[PDB]
Amino acid sequence: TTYADFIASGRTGRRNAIHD
Amino acid sequence: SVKEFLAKAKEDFLKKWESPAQNTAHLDQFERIKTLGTGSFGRVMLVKHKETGNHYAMKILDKQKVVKLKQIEHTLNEKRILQAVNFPFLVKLEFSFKDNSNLYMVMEYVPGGEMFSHLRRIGRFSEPHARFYAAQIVLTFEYLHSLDLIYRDLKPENLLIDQQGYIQVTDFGFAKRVKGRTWTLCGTPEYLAPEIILSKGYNKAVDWWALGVLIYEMAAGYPPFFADQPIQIYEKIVSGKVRFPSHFSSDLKDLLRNLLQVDLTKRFGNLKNGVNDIKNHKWFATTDWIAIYQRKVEAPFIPKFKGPGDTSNFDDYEEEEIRVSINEKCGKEFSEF
Ligand SMILES: O=C(c1cccc(I)c1)[C@H]1CNC[C@@H]1c1ccc2c(=O)[nH]cnc2c1
């Protein structure tokens, strides 16, 4: 499922901003 | 009518904008208690103001790290803007000052924690729940844009829940006053408008796209564009394709199609009627905007609390003693702060 793919991704924690 | 309310708001804002508050407190006036969150060049700590007993959230920025990351002007923007604005859903900047080593911005403490924490824990919000929050973002962007401000970092991590269960927007690190267009590549990958990624030059329309991403993430439990790598995220964003969970109502899908519109000339919030195309959408048909503004609507939930200065709604972070160099760093760069 899309949800399972999200939870197993590296991007479920807080997301940093990009600056450049 | 709202035309009139904004008019008066802009006069108030402009006065503080041209004559900003500066050096309104000192570090020793605050008892430092606990880190509430962190960033690449600073942290936010729960503090207690000694003379009043009030708890605040004090953002501490290391001047040298701000410089290394080329965020001098962004930080000056943040503070200048934050001391001049006033809105029910915008966190208040109560004092600012600086010392040899750091910049300090003392804001109201929002004890409910980040929307991010609640959202990840519960999985996703119901549509009514998401809508109640989204309404507050719509009104806040309406206010901010009427002042020629772009926010530029909407995401759950930057939205706090107050003791009433209402939203408080914080994190004005990328906010900017601009008439016309701007070019800075900044924001958070999942939330970037196609025109930012394409180096197009862009305007307040990027905030309305981000609102699209937020509502989606709130209702779905994950964002519309995600991957292990930022580059793969960018490719999805500019692909012009989006898929909706099968539980999304048809009205929600219609709304999101119009916000996550890759074409500036078609994006809601960017047409002739402006924000009213969003306010008048059927998904918002049940939303009483005035009741929302006045905080008269019952929240989807109230954060749990035990005694003031309780922090159970925030994650724990590694703590670090503050040090103030005996030598002033980057004086000229932050002169106006
Ligand atoms: O800790 C933070 C932060 C730290 C360093 C740089 C930046 I930008 C943000 C922000 C990140 N997003 C939420 C976090 C935060 C936490 C609590 C409050 C608060 O109680 N009042 C005002 N702003 C906050 C921001």
Tab-separated table of C-alpha atoms and ligand atoms in Angstrom:
chain	number	residue	atom	x	y	z
A	1	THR	CA	0.000	0.000	0.000
A	2	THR	CA	1.072	3.607	-0.418
A	3	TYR	CA	0.948	4.027	3.384
A	4	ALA	CA	3.253	1.012	3.922
A	5	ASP	CA	5.656	2.406	1.337
A	6	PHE	CA	5.683	5.752	3.171
A	7	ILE	CA	6.302	4.194	6.594
A	8	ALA	CA	9.176	2.161	5.175
A	9	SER	CA	10.721	5.222	3.487
A	10	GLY	CA	13.478	7.388	4.947
A	11	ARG	CA	11.254	10.441	5.042
A	12	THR	CA	8.747	9.900	7.857
A	13	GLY	CA	10.840	11.803	10.426
A	14	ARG	CA	11.123	15.576	10.594
A	15	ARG	CA	12.093	17.019	7.198
A	16	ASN	CA	14.953	19.478	6.887
A	17	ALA	CA	14.605	22.552	4.710
A	18	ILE	CA	16.934	23.102	1.765
A	19	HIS	CA	18.650	26.495	1.475
A	20	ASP	CA	20.645	26.761	-1.741
B	1	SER	CA	-15.489	43.855	3.941
B	2	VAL	CA	-12.462	41.655	4.698
B	3	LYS	CA	-10.911	44.183	2.309
B	4	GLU	CA	-11.370	46.751	5.076
B	5	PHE	CA	-9.999	44.541	7.864
B	6	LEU	CA	-6.830	43.879	5.877
B	7	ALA	CA	-6.457	47.571	5.046
B	8	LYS	CA	-6.267	48.452	8.742
B	9	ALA	CA	-3.991	45.474	9.383
B	10	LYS	CA	-1.514	46.697	6.785
B	11	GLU	CA	-1.230	50.149	8.347
B	12	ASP	CA	-0.390	48.551	11.697
B	13	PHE	CA	2.089	46.219	10.030
B	14	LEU	CA	3.758	48.926	7.956
B	15	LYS	CA	4.504	51.067	10.983
B	16	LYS	CA	6.401	48.311	12.776
B	17	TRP	CA	8.017	47.225	9.494
B	18	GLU	CA	9.620	50.650	8.996
B	19	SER	CA	10.521	51.089	12.669
B	20	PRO	CA	11.261	47.611	14.125
B	21	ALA	CA	11.577	46.783	17.825
B	22	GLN	CA	15.157	46.002	18.790
B	23	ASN	CA	16.952	44.830	21.947
B	24	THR	CA	13.850	44.469	24.129
B	25	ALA	CA	15.279	42.040	26.680
B	26	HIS	CA	18.470	40.321	27.929
B	27	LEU	CA	19.439	36.628	28.217
B	28	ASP	CA	19.753	36.721	32.024
B	29	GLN	CA	16.071	37.699	32.317
B	30	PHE	CA	15.153	34.132	31.325
B	31	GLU	CA	15.458	30.774	33.028
B	32	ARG	CA	16.367	28.167	30.370
B	33	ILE	CA	14.426	24.948	30.845
B	34	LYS	CA	14.349	22.512	27.930
B	35	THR	CA	14.878	22.185	24.178
B	36	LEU	CA	11.631	22.041	22.201
B	37	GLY	CA	13.186	21.622	18.760
B	38	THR	CA	16.309	22.143	16.684
B	39	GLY	CA	17.561	23.566	13.394
B	40	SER	CA	20.775	23.654	11.391
B	41	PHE	CA	21.990	26.877	13.074
B	42	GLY	CA	20.098	26.975	16.377
B	43	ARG	CA	17.487	25.584	18.755
B	44	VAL	CA	14.258	26.609	20.435
B	45	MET	CA	14.090	26.259	24.214
B	46	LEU	CA	11.289	26.512	26.739
B	47	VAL	CA	12.246	29.413	29.031
B	48	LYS	CA	10.628	31.189	31.949
B	49	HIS	CA	10.656	34.975	32.079
B	50	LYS	CA	11.733	35.756	35.648
B	51	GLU	CA	10.015	39.099	36.219
B	52	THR	CA	6.586	37.824	35.091
B	53	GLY	CA	6.694	34.031	35.483
B	54	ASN	CA	5.505	33.606	31.888
B	55	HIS	CA	6.798	30.675	29.871
B	56	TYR	CA	8.088	31.439	26.388
B	57	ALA	CA	9.763	29.642	23.528
B	58	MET	CA	13.185	31.170	22.961
B	59	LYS	CA	14.890	30.572	19.627
B	60	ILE	CA	18.665	30.736	19.936
B	61	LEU	CA	20.648	31.221	16.690
B	62	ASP	CA	24.432	30.990	16.512
B	63	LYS	CA	25.485	34.005	14.430
B	64	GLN	CA	28.512	32.163	13.011
B	65	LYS	CA	26.412	29.234	11.813
B	66	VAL	CA	23.846	31.596	10.259
B	67	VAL	CA	26.691	33.168	8.246
B	68	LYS	CA	28.185	29.818	7.154
B	69	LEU	CA	24.770	28.797	5.838
B	70	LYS	CA	24.220	32.110	4.027
B	71	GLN	CA	21.049	32.781	5.994
B	72	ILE	CA	21.942	36.277	7.205
B	73	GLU	CA	19.309	38.081	5.131
B	74	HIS	CA	16.720	35.316	5.728
B	75	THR	CA	17.238	35.734	9.471
B	76	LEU	CA	16.947	39.500	9.289
B	77	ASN	CA	13.732	38.946	7.257
B	78	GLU	CA	12.379	36.546	9.881
B	79	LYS	CA	12.856	38.873	12.840
B	80	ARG	CA	11.767	42.061	11.012
B	81	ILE	CA	8.597	40.412	9.761
B	82	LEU	CA	7.784	38.584	12.959
B	83	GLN	CA	7.946	41.699	15.162
B	84	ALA	CA	5.475	43.495	12.844
B	85	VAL	CA	2.701	40.964	12.333
B	86	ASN	CA	-0.395	40.252	14.397
B	87	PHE	CA	-2.877	37.440	13.688
B	88	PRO	CA	-4.758	34.869	15.818
B	89	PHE	CA	-2.986	31.954	14.146
B	90	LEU	CA	0.526	33.433	14.020
B	91	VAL	CA	2.847	32.883	16.953
B	92	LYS	CA	3.737	36.132	18.713
B	93	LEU	CA	7.318	37.454	18.902
B	94	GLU	CA	7.494	38.984	22.407
B	95	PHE	CA	11.150	40.097	22.621
B	96	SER	CA	14.340	39.958	20.581
B	97	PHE	CA	17.978	40.645	21.416
B	98	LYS	CA	21.491	39.466	20.617
B	99	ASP	CA	24.808	39.029	22.398
B	100	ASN	CA	28.404	38.307	21.353
B	101	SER	CA	27.517	34.831	20.068
B	102	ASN	CA	23.792	34.475	19.399
B	103	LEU	CA	20.564	35.992	18.164
B	104	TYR	CA	17.530	35.516	20.421
B	105	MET	CA	13.840	35.565	19.466
B	106	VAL	CA	11.418	35.017	22.329
B	107	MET	CA	8.029	33.853	21.062
B	108	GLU	CA	4.908	32.619	22.777
B	109	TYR	CA	5.180	28.987	23.927
B	110	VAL	CA	2.585	26.752	22.285
B	111	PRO	CA	2.281	23.799	24.692
B	112	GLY	CA	0.294	21.492	22.387
B	113	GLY	CA	3.322	20.406	20.343
B	114	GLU	CA	3.750	20.145	16.562
B	115	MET	CA	0.962	19.010	14.239
B	116	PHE	CA	3.668	16.723	12.853
B	117	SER	CA	3.813	14.662	16.066
B	118	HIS	CA	0.042	14.274	16.326
B	119	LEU	CA	-0.342	13.469	12.637
B	120	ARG	CA	2.367	10.781	12.564
B	121	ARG	CA	1.003	9.224	15.763
B	122	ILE	CA	-2.648	9.039	14.741
B	123	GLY	CA	-1.852	8.315	11.106
B	124	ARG	CA	-4.194	10.745	9.341
B	125	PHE	CA	-6.901	13.252	10.213
B	126	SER	CA	-10.559	12.933	9.162
B	127	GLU	CA	-11.645	15.421	6.504
B	128	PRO	CA	-13.499	17.667	8.963
B	129	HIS	CA	-10.387	17.650	11.166
B	130	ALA	CA	-8.034	18.531	8.272
B	131	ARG	CA	-10.491	21.187	7.054
B	132	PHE	CA	-10.618	22.940	10.444
B	133	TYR	CA	-6.797	23.299	10.328
B	134	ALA	CA	-6.668	24.143	6.624
B	135	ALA	CA	-9.179	26.961	7.167
B	136	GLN	CA	-6.767	28.567	9.633
B	137	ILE	CA	-3.917	28.324	7.115
B	138	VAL	CA	-6.163	29.896	4.441
B	139	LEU	CA	-6.955	32.886	6.663
B	140	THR	CA	-3.305	33.227	7.742
B	141	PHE	CA	-2.007	33.193	4.156
B	142	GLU	CA	-4.751	35.677	3.220
B	143	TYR	CA	-3.407	37.989	5.926
B	144	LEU	CA	0.291	37.436	5.118
B	145	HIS	CA	-0.124	37.857	1.348
B	146	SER	CA	-2.060	41.118	1.742
B	147	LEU	CA	1.144	42.406	3.386
B	148	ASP	CA	3.256	41.332	0.361
B	149	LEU	CA	4.697	38.496	2.454
B	150	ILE	CA	5.408	34.951	1.267
B	151	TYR	CA	5.721	32.257	3.924
B	152	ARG	CA	7.638	29.573	1.988
B	153	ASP	CA	7.903	26.710	4.515
B	154	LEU	CA	4.454	25.240	5.166
B	155	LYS	CA	4.561	21.742	6.702
B	156	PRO	CA	3.263	19.942	9.817
B	157	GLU	CA	6.646	20.432	11.538
B	158	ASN	CA	6.047	24.203	11.501
B	159	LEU	CA	2.480	24.252	12.870
B	160	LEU	CA	1.860	24.126	16.629
B	161	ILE	CA	-1.372	23.231	18.421
B	162	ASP	CA	-2.497	25.557	21.211
B	163	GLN	CA	-4.396	24.854	24.420
B	164	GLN	CA	-7.633	25.376	22.482
B	165	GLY	CA	-6.694	22.932	19.719
B	166	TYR	CA	-6.191	25.787	17.213
B	167	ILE	CA	-3.145	26.227	14.949
B	168	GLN	CA	-0.196	28.508	15.603
B	169	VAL	CA	2.096	29.039	12.608
B	170	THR	CA	5.758	29.461	13.556
B	171	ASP	CA	9.125	29.133	11.741
B	172	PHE	CA	9.279	32.354	9.707
B	173	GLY	CA	12.870	31.608	8.676
B	174	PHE	CA	12.027	31.840	4.959
B	175	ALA	CA	9.330	34.521	5.117
B	176	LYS	CA	10.037	37.489	2.851
B	177	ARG	CA	8.425	40.769	1.876
B	178	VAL	CA	8.439	40.904	-1.922
B	179	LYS	CA	6.360	42.667	-4.531
B	180	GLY	CA	6.603	40.938	-7.881
B	181	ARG	CA	8.777	37.827	-7.869
B	182	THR	CA	11.672	36.128	-6.089
B	183	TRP	CA	14.119	33.331	-6.964
B	184	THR	CA	15.601	31.786	-3.856
B	185	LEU	CA	15.613	27.997	-3.906
B	186	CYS	CA	14.274	27.310	-0.412
B	187	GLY	CA	11.605	25.340	1.395
B	188	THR	CA	11.238	21.627	2.141
B	189	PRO	CA	11.423	19.109	-0.734
B	190	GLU	CA	7.951	17.492	-0.318
B	191	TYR	CA	6.351	20.969	-0.290
B	192	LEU	CA	8.154	22.783	-3.147
B	193	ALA	CA	6.044	24.212	-6.016
B	194	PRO	CA	7.125	23.149	-9.519
B	195	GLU	CA	8.232	26.749	-10.244
B	196	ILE	CA	10.716	26.711	-7.375
B	197	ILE	CA	12.283	23.458	-8.580
B	198	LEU	CA	12.396	24.784	-12.145
B	199	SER	CA	14.178	27.973	-11.081
B	200	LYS	CA	11.345	29.915	-12.701
B	201	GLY	CA	11.052	32.949	-10.496
B	202	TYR	CA	7.958	32.726	-8.333
B	203	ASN	CA	5.488	34.522	-6.076
B	204	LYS	CA	2.890	33.896	-3.367
B	205	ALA	CA	1.312	31.147	-5.534
B	206	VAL	CA	3.920	28.804	-4.050
B	207	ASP	CA	2.207	29.085	-0.634
B	208	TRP	CA	-1.105	27.923	-2.148
B	209	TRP	CA	0.562	24.905	-3.744
B	210	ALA	CA	2.087	24.055	-0.358
B	211	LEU	CA	-1.393	24.323	1.216
B	212	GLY	CA	-2.362	21.641	-1.300
B	213	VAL	CA	0.470	19.389	-0.080
B	214	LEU	CA	-0.443	20.018	3.554
B	215	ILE	CA	-4.168	19.243	3.233
B	216	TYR	CA	-3.297	16.102	1.282
B	217	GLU	CA	-0.781	14.990	3.906
B	218	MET	CA	-3.207	15.728	6.735
B	219	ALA	CA	-6.060	13.738	5.112
B	220	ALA	CA	-3.947	10.885	3.693
B	221	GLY	CA	-1.260	10.401	6.351
B	222	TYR	CA	1.488	10.842	3.772
B	223	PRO	CA	2.325	13.590	1.222
B	224	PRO	CA	1.370	13.443	-2.468
B	225	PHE	CA	5.034	13.319	-3.563
B	226	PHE	CA	7.556	11.293	-1.569
B	227	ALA	CA	10.690	9.175	-2.215
B	228	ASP	CA	13.928	8.254	-0.426
B	229	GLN	CA	15.768	10.922	-2.449
B	230	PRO	CA	14.929	14.621	-2.848
B	231	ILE	CA	15.719	14.381	-6.571
B	232	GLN	CA	13.051	11.682	-7.049
B	233	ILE	CA	10.677	13.897	-5.115
B	234	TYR	CA	11.375	16.817	-7.480
B	235	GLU	CA	10.751	14.585	-10.513
B	236	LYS	CA	7.301	13.639	-9.155
B	237	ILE	CA	6.398	17.269	-8.381
B	238	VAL	CA	7.201	18.448	-11.917
B	239	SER	CA	5.695	15.357	-13.562
B	240	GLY	CA	2.251	16.941	-13.342
B	241	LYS	CA	0.731	13.748	-11.944
B	242	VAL	CA	-0.899	13.112	-8.578
B	243	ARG	CA	-2.861	10.180	-7.126
B	244	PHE	CA	-5.458	10.323	-4.321
B	245	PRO	CA	-6.313	7.728	-1.688
B	246	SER	CA	-9.642	6.070	-2.489
B	247	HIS	CA	-11.106	7.460	0.764
B	248	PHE	CA	-10.700	11.096	-0.387
B	249	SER	CA	-14.112	12.639	-1.078
B	250	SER	CA	-14.722	13.959	-4.579
B	251	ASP	CA	-14.822	17.534	-3.243
B	252	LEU	CA	-11.427	17.108	-1.575
B	253	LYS	CA	-9.943	15.724	-4.783
B	254	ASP	CA	-11.390	18.581	-6.803
B	255	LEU	CA	-9.917	21.147	-4.357
B	256	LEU	CA	-6.476	19.506	-4.395
B	257	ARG	CA	-6.423	19.272	-8.206
B	258	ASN	CA	-6.817	23.053	-8.244
B	259	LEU	CA	-4.166	23.718	-5.601
B	260	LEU	CA	-1.641	21.173	-6.868
B	261	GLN	CA	-2.013	22.760	-10.273
B	262	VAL	CA	1.363	22.881	-11.972
B	263	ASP	CA	0.103	25.797	-14.094
B	264	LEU	CA	0.287	29.155	-12.278
B	265	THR	CA	-2.436	30.423	-14.598
B	266	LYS	CA	-4.817	27.819	-13.225
B	267	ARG	CA	-3.865	27.446	-9.567
B	268	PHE	CA	-6.487	28.359	-6.982
B	269	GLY	CA	-5.409	31.357	-4.937
B	270	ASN	CA	-3.688	32.712	-8.052
B	271	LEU	CA	-6.691	33.574	-10.225
B	272	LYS	CA	-8.801	36.731	-10.465
B	273	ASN	CA	-10.869	35.988	-7.335
B	274	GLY	CA	-7.674	35.190	-5.384
B	275	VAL	CA	-8.189	33.368	-2.088
B	276	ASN	CA	-11.960	33.448	-2.552
B	277	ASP	CA	-11.777	30.615	-5.069
B	278	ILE	CA	-10.487	28.556	-2.142
B	279	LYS	CA	-12.840	29.964	0.482
B	280	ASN	CA	-15.833	29.388	-1.798
B	281	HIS	CA	-14.937	25.805	-2.719
B	282	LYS	CA	-17.524	23.135	-1.846
B	283	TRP	CA	-15.045	21.306	0.387
B	284	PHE	CA	-15.128	24.438	2.577
B	285	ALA	CA	-18.899	24.883	2.212
B	286	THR	CA	-19.402	23.983	5.879
B	287	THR	CA	-16.647	26.341	7.030
B	288	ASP	CA	-17.769	29.477	8.863
B	289	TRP	CA	-14.700	31.644	8.255
B	290	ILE	CA	-15.672	34.310	10.797
B	291	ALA	CA	-16.367	31.724	13.512
B	292	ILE	CA	-12.966	30.214	12.737
B	293	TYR	CA	-11.230	33.587	12.932
B	294	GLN	CA	-12.972	34.348	16.225
B	295	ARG	CA	-12.019	30.968	17.703
B	296	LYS	CA	-15.713	30.118	18.212
B	297	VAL	CA	-15.557	26.706	16.523
B	298	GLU	CA	-15.027	23.585	18.583
B	299	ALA	CA	-11.648	21.994	17.853
B	300	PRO	CA	-11.267	18.345	16.680
B	301	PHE	CA	-9.200	17.796	19.847
B	302	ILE	CA	-7.459	19.528	22.749
B	303	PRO	CA	-3.868	18.586	23.609
B	304	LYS	CA	-3.420	16.848	26.980
B	305	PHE	CA	-1.651	18.854	29.691
B	306	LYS	CA	-0.386	18.604	33.267
B	307	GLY	CA	0.747	21.806	34.976
B	308	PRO	CA	2.347	24.778	33.178
B	309	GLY	CA	5.751	24.264	31.559
B	310	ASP	CA	4.751	20.659	30.873
B	311	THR	CA	6.456	19.485	27.666
B	312	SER	CA	5.042	15.989	27.157
B	313	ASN	CA	3.740	17.018	23.733
B	314	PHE	CA	7.271	17.653	22.463
B	315	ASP	CA	10.027	15.163	21.711
B	316	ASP	CA	13.210	15.157	23.818
B	317	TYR	CA	16.355	16.614	22.272
B	318	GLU	CA	19.999	16.474	23.265
B	319	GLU	CA	20.743	19.482	25.479
B	320	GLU	CA	23.702	21.824	25.068
B	321	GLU	CA	24.927	24.464	27.500
B	322	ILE	CA	24.841	27.989	26.102
B	323	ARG	CA	28.179	29.701	25.670
B	324	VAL	CA	28.670	33.381	24.970
B	325	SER	CA	32.052	34.264	23.508
B	326	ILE	CA	34.045	37.063	25.090
B	327	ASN	CA	34.429	38.444	21.566
B	328	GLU	CA	31.562	39.808	19.478
B	329	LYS	CA	30.946	37.734	16.340
B	330	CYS	CA	29.518	39.085	13.062
B	331	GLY	CA	28.558	42.470	14.476
B	332	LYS	CA	28.114	44.275	11.193
B	333	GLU	CA	26.183	41.444	9.569
B	334	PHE	CA	23.468	41.567	12.237
B	335	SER	CA	23.614	45.275	13.079
B	336	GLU	CA	19.895	45.875	12.452
B	337	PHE	CA	18.760	42.784	14.434
C	1	LIG	O1	12.545	24.335	17.207
C	1	LIG	C1	12.353	24.921	16.147
C	1	LIG	C2	13.412	25.536	15.459
C	1	LIG	C3	14.707	25.508	15.994
C	1	LIG	C4	15.774	26.105	15.324
C	1	LIG	C5	15.548	26.738	14.094
C	1	LIG	C6	14.261	26.764	13.557
C	1	LIG	I1	13.901	27.664	11.728
C	1	LIG	C7	13.196	26.159	14.234
C	1	LIG	C8	10.958	24.911	15.498
C	1	LIG	C9	10.963	23.891	14.376
C	1	LIG	N1	9.527	23.739	14.086
C	1	LIG	C10	8.866	23.785	15.420
C	1	LIG	C11	9.963	24.228	16.429
C	1	LIG	C12	9.294	25.024	17.402
C	1	LIG	C13	8.869	24.446	18.608
C	1	LIG	C14	8.152	25.188	19.550
C	1	LIG	C15	7.831	26.526	19.294
C	1	LIG	C16	7.104	27.286	20.222
C	1	LIG	O2	6.701	26.816	21.286
C	1	LIG	N2	6.806	28.604	19.927
C	1	LIG	C17	7.217	29.143	18.780
C	1	LIG	N3	7.938	28.401	17.830
C	1	LIG	C18	8.236	27.109	18.084
C	1	LIG	C19	8.959	26.358	17.152
